[PDB]
Write a protein that binds this ligand. Structure first.
Ligand SMILES: O=C(O)CCC(=O)C(=O)O
Ligand SMILES: [Fe+3]
Length: 251
């Protein structure tokens, strides 16, 4: 049995990622693959216990699934994902954080402007922004179902109800200078984005869900300082073993 040889990003794609701080690959996973992930996400929402976040009734998100789900444990090692994480971070990598964020049809909340790295640095002791997130689109992402919205190039400045949100004046500057972009894509796409890129999102006013599986890969060299960590393993990983790619086996 055979896995397709590892695909990596072209130089132009890498350049775009580094310039903009995000990049979309369309149609990485097929419909049947996404349905397997959707079904597993539903199980995690149902069984996640303390790892679930709710609509202040409906479970809206869950954390740390790769530690508890064999499917999600395999996903983070996928030959569709791991080679690109290694390429972009120029290192062996591990998963710092894993979350699934559902924005159901005609529902969802405003995510205030933030940089993920600010949290990871201060809360988890991540020493540098040598990390990224891969957002797998469980559903088509459109203008109208609450897409992640970015300041392109806004990661280049460095580190600027969320604990760490960005104020009106600091954001005004960024946006006046750099603008705003909400990357779109079909179901099965992957949105790669930098640990330090400012992003936000709005409620879903479509009749369609916007499920995202967000895998945060960190450089092994850039492992967090667990002496200054404040969070459980399912929010901030402590096992820095380098990930290896899934091979094709008979089971
Ligand atoms: O799901 C979203 O719209 C925002 C997710 C996010 O930025 C985050 O969890 O840090
Ligand atoms: Fe975020």
């Amino acid at each position: 049995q055979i896995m397709e040889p590892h695909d990596t990003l072209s130089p132009a794609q890498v350049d775009e990622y580094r310039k903009n701080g995000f990049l979309v690959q369309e149609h990485v996973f097929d419909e049947e693959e996404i349905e397997l992930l959707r079904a597993e996400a539903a199980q995690e929402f149902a069984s996640g216990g303390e790892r679930v976040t709710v609509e202040q009734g409906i479970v809206r998100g869950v954390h740390g699934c790769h530690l508890y789900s064999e499917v999600f444990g395999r996903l983070v090692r996928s030959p569709r994902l791991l080679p690109i994480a290694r390429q972009l971070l120029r290192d062996d990598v591990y998963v710092h954080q894993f979350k699934i964020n559902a924005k159901r049809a005609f529902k969802g909340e405003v995510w205030e402007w933030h940089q993920d790295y600010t949290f990871w640095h201060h809360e988890d002791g991540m020493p540098a922004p040598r990390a990224l997130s891969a957002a797998i689109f469980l559903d088509e992402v459109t203008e109208f179902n609450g897409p992640l919205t970015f300041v392109p190039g806004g990661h280049g400045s460095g580190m600027i109800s969320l604990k760490y949100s960005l104020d009106v004046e600091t954001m005004r500057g960024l946006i006046e200078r750099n603008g705003m972009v909400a990357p779109k894509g079909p179901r099965g796409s992957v949105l790669w984005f930098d640990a330090n890129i400012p992003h936000s999102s709005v409620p879903n006013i479509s009749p369609f869900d916007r499920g995202l599986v967000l895998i945060t890969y960190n450089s092994v060299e850039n492992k967090t300082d667990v002496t200054r960590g404040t969070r459980p393993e399912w929010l901030a990983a402590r096992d820095f073993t380098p990930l290896t790619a899934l091979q094709a086996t008979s089971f």
